[PDB]
Amino acid sequence: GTTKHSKLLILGSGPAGYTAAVYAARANLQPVLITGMEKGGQLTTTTEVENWPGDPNDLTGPLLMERMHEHATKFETEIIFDHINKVDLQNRPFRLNGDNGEYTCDALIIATGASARYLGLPSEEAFKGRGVSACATCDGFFYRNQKVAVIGGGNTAVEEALYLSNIASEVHLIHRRDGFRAEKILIKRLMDKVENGNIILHTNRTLEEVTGDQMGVTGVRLRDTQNSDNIESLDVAGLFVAIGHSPNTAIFEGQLELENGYIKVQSGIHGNATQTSIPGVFAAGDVMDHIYRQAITSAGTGCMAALDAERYLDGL
Amino acid sequence: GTTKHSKLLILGSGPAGYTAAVYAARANLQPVLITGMEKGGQLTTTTEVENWPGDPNDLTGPLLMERMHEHATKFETEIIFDHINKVDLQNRPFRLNGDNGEYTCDALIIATGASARYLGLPSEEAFKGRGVSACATCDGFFYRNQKVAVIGGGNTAVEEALYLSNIASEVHLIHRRDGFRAEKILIKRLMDKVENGNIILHTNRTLEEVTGDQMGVTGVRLRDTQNSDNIESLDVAGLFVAIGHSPNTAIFEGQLELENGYIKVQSGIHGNATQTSIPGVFAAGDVMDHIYRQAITSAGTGCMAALDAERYLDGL
Numbered sequence: 001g002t003t004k005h006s007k008l009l010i011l012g013s014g015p016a017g018y019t020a021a022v023y024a025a026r027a028n029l030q031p032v033l034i035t036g037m038e039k040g041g042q043l044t045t046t047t048e049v050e051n052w053p054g055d056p057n058d059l060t061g062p063l064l065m066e067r068m069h070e071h072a073t074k075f076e077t078e079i080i081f082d083h084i085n086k087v088d089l090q091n092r093p094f095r096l097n098g099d100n101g102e103y104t105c106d107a108l109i110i111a112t113g114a115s116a117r118y119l120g121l122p123s124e125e126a127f128k129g130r131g132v133s134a135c136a137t138c139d140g141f142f143y144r145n146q147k148v149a150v151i152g153g154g155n156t157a158v159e160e161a162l163y164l165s166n167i168a169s170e171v172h173l174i175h176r177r178d179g180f181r182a183e184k185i186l187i188k189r190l191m192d193k194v195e196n197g198n199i200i201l202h203t204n205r206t207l208e209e210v211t212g213d214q215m216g217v218t219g220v221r222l223r224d225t226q227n228s229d230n231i232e233s234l235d236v237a238g239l240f241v242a243i244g245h246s247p248n249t250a251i252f253e254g255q256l257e258l259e260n261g262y263i264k265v266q267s268g269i270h271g272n273a274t275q276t277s278i279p280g281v282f283a284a285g286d287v288m289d290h291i292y293r294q295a296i297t298s299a300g301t302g303c304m305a306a307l308d309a310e311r312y313l314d315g316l
Numbered sequence: 317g318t319t320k321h322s323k324l325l326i327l328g329s330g331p332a333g334y335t336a337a338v339y340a341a342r343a344n345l346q347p348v349l350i351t352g353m354e355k356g357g358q359l360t361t362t363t364e365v366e367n368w369p370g371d372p373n374d375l376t377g378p379l380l381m382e383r384m385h386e387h388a389t390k391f392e393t394e395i396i397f398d399h400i401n402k403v404d405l406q407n408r409p410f411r412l413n414g415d416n417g418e419y420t421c422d423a424l425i426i427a428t429g430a431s432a433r434y435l436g437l438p439s440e441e442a443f444k445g446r447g448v449s450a451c452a453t454c455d456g457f458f459y460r461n462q463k464v465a466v467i468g469g470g471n472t473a474v475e476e477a478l479y480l481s482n483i484a485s486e487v488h489l490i491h492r493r494d495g496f497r498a499e500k501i502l503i504k505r506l507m508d509k510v511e512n513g514n515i516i517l518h519t520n521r522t523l524e525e526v527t528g529d530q531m532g533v534t535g536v537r538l539r540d541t542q543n544s545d546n547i548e549s550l551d552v553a554g555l556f557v558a559i560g561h562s563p564n565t566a567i568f569e570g571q572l573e574l575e576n577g578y579i580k581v582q583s584g585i586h587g588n589a590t591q592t593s594i595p596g597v598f599a600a601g602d603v604m605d606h607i608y609r610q611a612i613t614s615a616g617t618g619c620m621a622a623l624d625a626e627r628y629l630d631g632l
């Protein structure tokens with residue numbers, strides 16, 4: 001096997017990885033970026049994007065990522081198609097083992113993301129990008145003054161339902177259990193919106209099917225209750241599956257400090273904000289952010305990571 | 317006078333103000349944005365921008381800001397051309413006095429920036445955007461393998477000279493004093509680059525003139541020493557005036573916690589990262605960031621501020 005050394009190595013080809021690559025390349029660091037299996041990241045799984053600032057019309061997730069790829073290669077970023085399966089971050093240089101070889105580096109930017117999970121239903125698969133969504137902040141404004149359904153039982157699902165009730169005419173929260181596995185302040189606000197307004201609760205229901213026409217989702221078929229096969233039918237314009245994200249950090253367990261699988265960074269207002277618990281290793285994007293989860297915040301921390309990496313590499 | 321109330325008010329029309337406006341508008345908050353005197357912010361004072369991610373070619377600062385304005389107005393952001401001169405943030409709703417009236421709001425996003433200072437020389441005025449720059453991270457890659465001059469004596473100037481020595485063939489640091497008003501770790505690294513390389517020091521010199529041709533800067537004329545009018549002439553491709561920034565926060569003194577004029581935010585990885593010392597008041601952009609100072613990091617915190625504001629306005 002081969003062993004390639006780089007001063008700076010970037011893991012991930014989503015908005016955080018690519019912005020860190022254009023800032024590192026314009027700092028004359030000659031960055032090497034490893035793409036992972038999902039070349040272009042999570043945005044290649046969506047259709048229209050209208051909250052990337054400065055792109056009012058006609059943008060899709062694939063088109064933004066094609067442009068980001070162009071930007072990085074313009075500044076001669078070395079892009080390798082490989083995926084990392086093992087890491088040693090306790091010796092110098094850091095050693096990373098991929099499928100096509102070994103990589104060592106003096107500084108590392110981890111931008112591996114936190115991918116959305118779906119239900120696995122064929123009717124859900126059918127309507128992705130045309131009515132089924134996994135991000136309410138992203139797509140909730142398309143369903144303004146319309147009926148919407150959210151499915152899930154954790155913190156994310158109550159958060160998405162709560163955000164959506166200020167946009168949609170009504171929100172239908174669907175869950176298998178007879179209660180939510182969410183935060184105290186979230187369930188207080190939820191029950192206030194249930195009693196004095198917008199959110200219709202649907203506990204002890206499971207999602208059987210996503211129905212729709214040629215243009216998209218028009219309904220959702222539910223079933224069960226506490227002992228009976230009741231079956232409900234709901235007229236809805238969009239479904240927001242909110243069952244959780246999977247931070248891509250199993251490879252870092254026992255190496256870096258994690259917080260529910262998310263990489264813990266230093267943060268703060270005094271610099272070196274993207275540094276993880278190991279000096280020389282930095283993180284950017286959704287892998288270190290479980291609150292905002294946007295392409296613009298991922299590009300912002302990607303930039304911070306490249307400048308923190310440059311300052312580290314120069315003894316500051 | 318008029319007194320207009322808004323649920324959410326945004327101050328500033330730079331990248332942070334406009335991104336907070338598109339995220340607030342797509343959250344159905346109907347944001348009101350007040351532009352300030354400098355409509356479009358600091359980026360309207362520069363020429364080519366090639367580190368806004370996903371825009372590899374043909375972008376200028378004015379064009380990005382024209383597009384951001386379009387994006388905000390597409391989502392019906394109410395834009396007011398006015399400037400705030402007095403503020404009361406200790407009573408509810410917050411009261412802000414402008415030149416064309418009074419404004420009250422339930423949540424406030426401050427995105428007023430930190431403007432760069434120049435020397436005030438007519439020859440410097442002449443070459444702005446074509447050889448004279450105030451941001452080395454921004455424009456340093458255009459002067460790769462070329463000679464460059466930085467003028468200033470504080471932390472910023474030593475930081476800019478240090479960053480530039482990895483790009484430029486040589487860096488000429490110019491200062492009036494016989495020493496730098498900078499950090500301990502910065503001056504150690506500076507003196508290492510002075511002795512073993514790239515940085516040529518020019519203490520007890522002042523800048524008399526910026527010379528150049530039709531395409532841009534080709535030189536710099538210096539004068540003085542400790543008792544003598546020596547006059548040096550330097551062949552250089554770019555001048556980086558690094559004498560400091562002015563956070564636009566005089567209006568907030570005694571109201572919010574400041575740190576060398578920069579608004580202190582909560583930061584962190586657990587949400588509500590842009591909140592200042594007052595609940596309901598948030599900050600984004602260069603006004604709260606003295607480390608990275610980029611349009612992409614300003615747009616990223618603009619987004620965080622709008623989502624923090626939305627969560628605040630909804631009792632979370």
Ligand SMILES: Cc1cc2nc3c(=O)[nH]c(=O)nc-3n(C[C@H](O)[C@H](O)[C@H](O)COP(=O)(O)OP(=O)(O)OC[C@H]3O[C@@H](n4cnc5c(N)ncnc54)[C@H](O)[C@@H]3O)c2cc1C
Pocket residue numbers: 011012013014015016017034035036037038039040041042043045046048049050051052082083084085111112113114115116133134135138139248251284285286287293294295296298
């Ligand atoms: C349905 C949906 C719609 C969305 N719509 C929007 C929208 O309209 N606007 C918006 O702002 N945001 C949107 N988002 C959120 C946005 O997709 C994410 O915030 C953003 O993509 C995160 O960027 P990232 O670079 O952190 O990670 P990701 O884009 O997740 O990319 C992670 C990268 O890391 C690589 N990687 C993973 N593991 C390894 C490994 N072991 N070795 C090497 N590489 C590895 C992957 O292959 C991938 O390239 C949406 C998300 C979803 C799921």
Ligand SMILES: Cc1cc2nc3c(=O)[nH]c(=O)nc-3n(C[C@H](O)[C@H](O)[C@H](O)COP(=O)(O)OP(=O)(O)OC[C@H]3O[C@@H](n4cnc5c(N)ncnc54)[C@H](O)[C@@H]3O)c2cc1C
Pocket residue numbers: 327328329330331332333350351352353354355356357358359361362364365366367368398399400401427428429430431432449450451454455564567600601602603609610611612614
């Ligand atoms: C010479 C130069 C070149 C640069 N080039 C680049 C580049 O290539 N790429 C890059 O990423 N970054 C670049 N930058 C940095 C970039 O300009 C800033 O990071 C960014 O503009 C900051 O955005 P902001 O929204 O925080 O504030 P600003 O853009 O500074 O805008 C502040 C806004 O607040 C308003 N305001 C101020 N006071 C008041 C008040 N009292 N009432 C109401 N409104 C008020 C102002 O009118 C203005 O609209 C450059 C900077 C300079 C100076």
